[PDB]
Design a protein around this nucleic acid. Structure first.
Lengths: 306, 335, 45, 45
RNA sequence: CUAAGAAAUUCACGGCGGGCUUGAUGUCCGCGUCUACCUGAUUCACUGCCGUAUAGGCAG
């Protein structure tokens, strides 16, 4: 969509029990839809008051730790669960496996609007930080950095630079700040061209199979592993329609009766974990919302990446 | 007619973090920011059979053949160092606020009726009985679950954290504040007004809770234990796994939350237990028995329906319990 | 010599290992998981 | 030029190194470990 | 307005029994490391005198 007028940096945010179950096919880091919905919840809660439009999100993930455990004698992993309460008779309830993970991410969220000129930059930065302190990011509480050495503050970098050199200079200053992490971007063109080459190899190939080929460490005979460009992962890239769009007060047991509902299903794209100084433009690497509601296809990606 | 909403969901207010445990010596507790962490390590246990036998394993030949084959595990154990007698358990707690507003509600008529009922309660009697009990469960170190039962002296330090620095510091003797009497004190009531202003306001109030306990040199501490199904197949594995965030033993946040919610002294069965955790159909996991059964009119759901739908306001203790469930959270709703 | 031993109060299934002469921890569960494991693997080694 | 050399009475496997022109001590073992290492790495460098 | 919203794994435990790793062995020939520099930037905030003084001055 539209380009950001400024680039706010929420600092290293600790999330204690995020949803490690991203999707029915992927586990690990939470879905980027969690971060885009979080930024839209931030806009819904302070962006209408500071007259700004917080839009887009850059995911950095300084550290990650899934609450998993590899069982004895297996190559796979399982999830450490919680003990839910008993039922009304004292019987143990049926265990529903939820993944939990401890994250330390920082969010490069793009901000544009008329509120940039009305308030100081540090003022709106402190406002959205004090709002995000009372929120949750993927089902996990945001730990607010109390009584450590020093709180990591904000810096709203203005994307409009007086030069190209000043723009690259404070961009390099920001990239040094979010440097111990690993930026997550949407790489769907590489998945599409990998589909084309794999279809050239053997026809009627799905890009589900191209995704699966880009995930696995496949071996080749002369033995040599297939090289992979970068840290290629599968991500859930939004939802696809399974149902016609129902009326607000038509579907039974919705969340609300003023919003149209539609039964949907995940869409598994591809993402790439790269170091944040590779991109040379932090105006990119932001995850936006692309609905196109008449067709379905509610999805998120990083447009203007390459 | 004002029927019950089909999707009800309240977010968890009183959100704690994972209680990191570290260890050092008492009477240098004020320099306890570089105390080394209590680490979870492995040890082999070997036991004889001590369970009850099922009356077909009571043949003395079968018993003597059984006790010649012991049963070997490798448990996780967390001990203090041999030159450190104090366990420092340190977690943070966000008191969020907006305690009555549901995160999801279907019927807007039911939503406004619930907001009117909650505001009727708050304007009538604010969060002053509830936050007093939450300040008690922060004050006595009940979140020290088994690390409290044999301690010589437990001291809890609670620091209100403003934008980057401490705004107000408390200090309690957690053994004097009992585990069953919600009495009155000046500092406890100051903490109660702080948690009340947290739960009533729009923004969050953040507290840092530190608890020290003199256990003894090298004694065993009890971090949270992990619930893992599928322990493994056809090998030897661990029977007991302890929680540890980053090579540092820890209590789960939901165990700290269950300790903080242990305020319910109003369940109709006698208080041989004392306070229990605030839950709909209030069910103690260790007891295995669910008090506040729906057979009596004293669980959460029927009290909420009588309070909101047909305006049958219950006793002040029971509506304390109902608003304590609303602070607790939950996912409610029928088909 | 029994292949599985349920520790009854503690909800643990111990499977006999032949290398060392002892039982080792197999999985959690009670009498139902014990009987199901007996049906799958057969008792008495 | 052979990649492995078993010293037969002394139960030592010597693997050829190319930097210095000599064999160096690889591991212990006899003809079976030598044949297994030949099957894994291939002889004749 | 975040595969949203919720959650106590836990009580007990004896891993010890015992033991010979050994014989043998040539690392070794050969070699050019040179070239050229401001440690000084106030870089020694010193010693003492008058004064009751630490207040304030003075001398070199």
């Amino acid at each position: 969509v539209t380009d950001p007028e400024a680039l706010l940096l929420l600092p290293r945010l600790s999330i204690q029990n995020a949803n490690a179950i991203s999707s029915p096919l992927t586990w690990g880091f939470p879905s980027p839809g969690a971060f885009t919905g979080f930024v839209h919840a931030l806009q819904r809660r302070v962006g209408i008051s500071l007259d700004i439009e917080l839009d887009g999100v850059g995911i950095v993930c300084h550290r990650f730790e899934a609450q998993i455990s590899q069982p004895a004698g297996k190559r796979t992993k399982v999830f450490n669960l919680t003990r839910n309460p008993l039922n009304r008779d004292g019987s143990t309830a049926a265990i529903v496996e939820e993944g939990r993970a401890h994250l330390e991410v920082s969010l490069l969220l793009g901000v544009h609007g008329d509120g940039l000129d009305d308030h100081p930059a540090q003022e709106i930065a402190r406002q959205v930080q004090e709002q995000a302190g009372a929120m949750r990011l993927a089902g996990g509480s945001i730990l607010p950095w109390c009584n450590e050495r020093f709180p990591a503050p904000n810096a709203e970098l203005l994307m409009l630079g007086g030069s190209d050199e000043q723009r690259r200079k404070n961009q390099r200053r920001l990239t040094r700040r979010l440097l111990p992490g690993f930026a997550l971007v949407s790489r769907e063109a590489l998945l599409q061209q990998h589909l084309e080459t794999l279809r050239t190899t053997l026809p009627e190939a799905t890009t589900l199979d191209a995704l699966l080929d880009l995930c696995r460490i496949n071996f080749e005979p002369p033995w040599q592993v297939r090289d992979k460009p970068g840290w290629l992962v599968p991500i859930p890239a939004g939802y696809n329609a399974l149902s016609p769009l129902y009326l607000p007060g038509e579907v039974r047991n919705a969340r609300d009766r003023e919003t149209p509902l539609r039964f949907v299903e995940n869409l598994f794209g591809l993402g790439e974990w790269l170091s944040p100084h590779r991109v040379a433009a932090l105006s990119d690497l932001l995850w936006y919302h692309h609905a196109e509601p008449d067709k379905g296809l509610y999805r998120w990606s990083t447009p203007r990446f390459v | 007619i004002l029927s019950t909403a089909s999707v009800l969901a309240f977010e968890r207010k009183l959100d704690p973090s994972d209680a990191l445990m570290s260890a050092g010596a008492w009477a240098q507790r004020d320099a306890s920011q570089e105390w080394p962490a209590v680490t979870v390590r492995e040890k082999s246990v070997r036991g004889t059979i001590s369970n009850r036998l099922k009356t077909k394993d009571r043949d003395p030949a079968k018993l003597d053949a059984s006790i010649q084959s012991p049963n070997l595990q490798t448990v996780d154990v967390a001990n203090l160092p041999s030159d450190a007698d104090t366990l420092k358990v340190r977690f943070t707690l966000r008191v969020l606020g907006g305690a009555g507003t549901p995160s999801a509600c279907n019927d807007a008529a039911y939503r406004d009726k619930l907001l009117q009922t909650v505001a009727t309660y708050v304007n009538d009697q604010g969060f002053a009985e509830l936050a007093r009990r939450y300040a008690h469960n922060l004050a006595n170190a009940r979140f020290l679950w088994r690390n409290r039962v044999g301690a010589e002296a437990v001291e809890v330090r609670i620091n209100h954290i403003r934008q980057g620095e401490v705004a107000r510091a408390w200090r309690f003797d957690a053994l004097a504040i009992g585990l069953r009497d919600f009495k009155a004190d000046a500092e406890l009531d100051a903490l109660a007004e702080l948690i009340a202003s947290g739960l009533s306001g729009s923004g969050h109030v953040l507290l840092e809770v530190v608890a020290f306990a003199r256990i003894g040199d090298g004694q065993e501490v009890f971090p949270s234990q992990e619930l893992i199904l599928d322990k493994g197949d056809k090998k030897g594995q661990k029977s007991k796994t302890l929680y540890s965030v980053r090579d540092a033993a820890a209590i789960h946040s939901q165990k700290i939350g269950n300790a903080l919610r242990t305020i319910d002294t109003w369940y109709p069965d006698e208080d041989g237990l004392g306070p229990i955790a605030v839950e709909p159909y209030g069910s103690v996991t260790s007891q295995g028995k669910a008090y506040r059964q729906p057979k009596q009119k004293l669980d959460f759901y029927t009290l909420l329906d009588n309070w909101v739908l047909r305006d049958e306001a219950p006793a002040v203790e029971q509506q304390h319990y109902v608003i304590a469930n609303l602070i607790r959270g939950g996912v409610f709703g029928e088909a | 010599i029994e292949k599985f031993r349920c520790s009854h109060g503690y909800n643990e299934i111990y499977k006999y290992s032949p290398d060392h002469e002892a039982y080792l921890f197999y999985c959690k569960g009670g009498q139902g998981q014990l009987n199901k494991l007996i049906a799958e693997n057969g008792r008495f080694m």
